[PDB]
Curated annotation (Swiss-Prot), chain B:
Reactions performed catalytically: D-cysteine + H2O = hydrogen sulfide + pyruvate + NH4(+) + H(+)
Protein name listed in UniProt: D-cysteine desulfhydrase
Keyword Protein biosynthesis part of the UniProt annotation: no
Family per similarity comment: Belongs to the ACC deaminase/D-cysteine desulfhydrase family.
PANTHER family: 1-AMINOCYCLOPROPANE-1-CARBOXYLATE DEAMINASE-RELATED (PTHR43780:SF2)
């Protein structure tokens, strides 16, 4: 009942059936607690990820406007850009990507392989910038010049993280609650927290469907201080768009992303090696490896509410493995 | 259903209309998304591993042993499954093209092998794969492990049962939504081809199955597919009378080397549909499908189903060149 205003928003279908929610018996054995995983890395468009959920809503909205071009921004190895470009090609929309190099690498695989490779396959128009210092303004500058060519453009923010985009993860929460019914009583849910729409959609959904479940966002780019107001605004705007309130507090851990966004760290790469070796599951150096390292330290240091089951949201990211090898 | 099987896939994989590609080609083209199986970037081999690794467990094996190219998709999938189950994986690898290109050597599927803690054994050539795996199975057993051997591509009669299963999905998914005329799959180690051959003969007898070869001539390949076809049919107490159809014009200059038509097929599907093929298998098979339209080489000009057998992580190994 509580989330029924969701059907008011037009949406496309890119996924179809609920993504798998699987027990991780070997990781659970090693960690000493029940770990489950939500497999949003297996969404069926061009190597999947958390963004296909958001794009179902955003692109549906783009088409309502009669738009024929999608314009977004991110890192050279951004998964969002890649899923956006894939969806654009699929629909015969044009796509324009404002890309940056957030880490100052000159490594050829970072510059040319992985997610950046696939963008050329989708015929993405690539616009390089020194830095995404003001992505929203920079995207509007780009859309103006693109509009001048006669294109009918639609601006998708970094990570598709607007209140409309985040509706995909309100919907994920409905899936998750449905799959967990009578099978597992969850205590905690862990997801990486970057552009913030995934965290925020899940925050709203879980508050209304699974009140007593603790949602933990592991930051990938920012301190709790910088990040919390970003999640809160989406949460609040999302709630209002669904005619609900949201009084849940937002929870964030920021101890797992140093030296900074897009830079691999030891605990992240050890989490990647753990999931691969024990579960045959592929994480990534930027997002999920670092999120999972937070889950692990969280168990180690007893940072969760209790000792009960934890759901890790696999938000994708694997193609970046190939861009980060051998280094930088 | 008389064979023990492990659950690696679950729900039937999508079967989709490809409207933009259909528009461009002037033919109705559908796709079977076996690239979207949920284990370590998927592929056609997981269908086979459901039967093969179930068999391994029945024998109380603690180690999976298989063979392939450095960038073999099958090796990668076997290792992922091995990891997931707490089995050791030993892989026998060759460099089938003599490249020194770093991405082919260490990126793509070969990078994942290290993540899955795969024990890597290098060999000069897989000249007799069945024999060399058996020599390796002896060595590893001598160290105190209990190995189970999986052939190249897991293409035994038992493994190919995965693709008789796939046919069931296809048959259910295609009716009533279309009036299919032709099916196209890449034909390599022959497990995927022969399994679909048995299944489609019985389930959709009016459809033409075409295997585009990726490593051999029609003369070298046809007995391979026919033999598996007969072996599979026997173990299911069925008779398989149907012809095997093979086109071999689409893989020069050899296995694991990309060609222009294949890369143009990779580009075409990515740009028109947001679908990713690969330089070794599906790209070359799709090029075969496209040329069949220009040369009017299909039995009739009706709907075609392409079987996406996976392969995409190879893109990252093959870039920027080999
Ligand atoms: C695999 C993966 N996991 C988690 C996240 C974090 O999600 P949010 O951006 O919704 O907070 C991303 C985001 N990535 C960004 C991108 O540009 O790709 C949006 C920043 C992701 O790609
Ligand atoms: C993506 C992809 N597509 C098609 C095929 C051909 O299937 P068959 O081997 O069943 O004929 C492979 C094979 N795999 C090879 C490997 O070593 O990876 C020869 C097995 C494949 O990986």
């Amino acid at each position: 009942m509580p989330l029924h205003h969701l059907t008011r928003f037009p949406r496309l279908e890119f996924i179809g059936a609920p993504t798998p929610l699987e027990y991780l018996p070997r990781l659970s054995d090693y960690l000493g607690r029940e770990i489950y995983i939500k497999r949003d890395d297996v969404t069926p468009i061009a190597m999947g990820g958390n963004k296909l959920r958001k794009l179902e809503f955003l692109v549906a909205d783009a088409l309502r406007e009669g738009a024929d071009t999608l314009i977004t921004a991110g890192a050279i190895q951004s998964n969002h850009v890649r899923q956006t470009a894939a969806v654009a090609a699929k629909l015969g929309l044009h796509c324009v990507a404002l890309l940056e190099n957030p880490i100052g690498t000159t490594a050829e695989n970072y510059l040319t392989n992985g997610n950046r490779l696939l963008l050329d396959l989708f015929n993405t128009q690539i616009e390089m910038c020194d830095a995404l210092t003001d992505p929203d303004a920079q995207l509007q500058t780009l859309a103006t010049r693109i509009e001048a060519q006669g294109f009918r453009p639609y601006v998708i923010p970094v990570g598709g993280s607007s209140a409309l985009g985040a509706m995909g993860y309100v919907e994920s929460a409905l899936e998750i609650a449905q799959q967990c019914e009578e099978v597992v009583g969850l205590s905690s849910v862990v997801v990486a927290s970057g552009s913030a729409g995934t965290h925020a959609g899940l925050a709203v959904g879980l508050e209304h469907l699974m009140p007593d479940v603790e949602l933990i966002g592991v930051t990938v780019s920012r301190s709790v201080a910088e990040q919390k107001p970003k999640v809160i605004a989406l949460q609040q705007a999302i709630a209002g768009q669904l005619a609900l309130t949201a009084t849940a507090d937002i929870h964030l851990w920021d101890d797992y992303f140093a030296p900074g966004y897009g830079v691999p760290n030891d605990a992240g790469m050890e989490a990647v090696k753990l999931l691969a070796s024990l579960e045959g599951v592929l994480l990534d150096p930027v997002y999920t490896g670092k999120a999972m390292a937070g889950l692990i330290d969280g168990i180690s240091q007893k940072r969760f509410n209790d000792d009960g089951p934890i759901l890790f949201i696999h938000t994708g990211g694997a193609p970046a493995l190939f861009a980060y090898h051998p280094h930088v």
